[PDB]
């Protein structure tokens, strides 16, 4: 049993399941359609849900490629739209990745 | 005293804003989360805002993006700054507290309470 | 106006008074119930939290049961001083905003 425990939002529990894809479903963690079983999932807003406010986890948003499935991403290279590099503090087509 | 003062809602003008100040006593301002409470005339209990001893704060979601609300730790105390005035505002409001983890928690302090009235 | 409140209650002299307060199975079912009593003109106050435990000093003349996802409060021997107002306090999760609503207010008569 290969028990993955991750924190996802509320809205995206429709794609948790195998065979559907989307922002989250192939840029972070990508089900492979042969994928037999299905996953366990509950509300966690009296565990980690705050008043304060929480900022313990993160997602993927831009890709240069998708990924292959099951292989860990790790290196969080930042991403850029036009061909002249940049560097320093944002300015024109730079932006942060995440 | 234990006790949380806020000053009743006057008369003024259209165009004009409101404040009112709330100032905890008896106990340390970092101790109990700060909670709104509306009362209308023959009408039940209404809740609009919520500011934290130390932290962040929840806005009304039919009040949004004209009702001026923050968080001072110096004087123990918080202005909320209204705006745009309407008859809606008859009613009575609550300046309370709650327990230190929210949730399931005590409401020990309660406020005398500020009538305000608008009419034209 | 999800929540549902008998305007009134009415009864002959003598006889045990009940008072059902019955929601959904998020507040109730799944959350503890406050049980709170308003005097006319007074802030409400907390008087059973939890149904486990209740505050010092309180008589046990009231009862207090819960069935199914609903609960109802048994007064056995009314008095001509019983008539004051009742809340009902749960976490309910609204399709607008979720938080604590409370009760509108019952309001009791004796002739």
């Known amino acids: 049993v290969y028990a993955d425990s991750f924190v996802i939002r509320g809205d995206e529990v429709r794609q948790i399941a195998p065979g559907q894809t989307g922002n989250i479903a192939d840029y972070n963690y990508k089900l492979p359609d042969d994928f037999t079983g299905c996953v366990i999932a509950w509300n966690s807003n009296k565990l980690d849900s705050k008043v304060s406010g929480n900022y313990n986890y993160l997602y993927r948003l831009f890709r240069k490629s998708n990924l292959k499935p099951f292989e860990r991403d790790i290196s969080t290279e930042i991403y850029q739209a036009g061909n002249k590099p940049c560097n320093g503090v944002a300015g024109f087509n730079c932006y942060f990745p995440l | 005293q234990v006790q949380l003062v806020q000053s009743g809602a006057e008369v003024k003008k259209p165009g004009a804003s409101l404040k009112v100040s709330c100032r905890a006593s008896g106990y340390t301002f970092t101790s109990h989360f700060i909670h709104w409470v509306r009362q209308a005339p023959g009408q039940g209990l209404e809740w609009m805002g919520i500011?934290?001893?130390?932290?962040?704060?929840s806005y009304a979601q039919n009040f949004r993006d004209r009702v001026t609300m923050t968080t001072d730790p110096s004087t123990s105390t918080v202005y909320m700054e209204l705006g745009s005035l309407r008859s809606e505002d008859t009613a009575v409001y609550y300046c309370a507290r709650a327990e230190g983890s929210s949730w399931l928690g005590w409401f020990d302090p309660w406020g005398q309470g500020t009538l305000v009235t608008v009419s034209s | 106006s999800v929540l549902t409140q008998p305007p009134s209650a009415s009864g002959t002299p003598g006889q045990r008074v009940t008072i059902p307060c019955s929601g959904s199975?998020?507040?109730?079912?799944?959350?503890?119930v406050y049980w709170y009593q308003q005097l006319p003109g007074t802030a409400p106050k907390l008087l059973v939290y939890?149904?486990?435990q209740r505050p010092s000093g309180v008589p046990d003349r009231f009862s207090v049961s819960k069935s199914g996802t609903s609960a109802s409060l048994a007064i056995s021997g009314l008095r001509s001083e019983d008539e004051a107002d009742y809340y009902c306090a749960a976490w309910d999760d609204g399709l607008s905003g979720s938080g604590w609503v409370f009760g509108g207010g019952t309001k009791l008569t004796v002739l």
């Open positions: 199975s998020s507040n109730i079912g799944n959350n503890y």
């Open positions: 939890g149904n486990n």
């Open positions: 500011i934290n001893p130390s932290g962040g704060a």
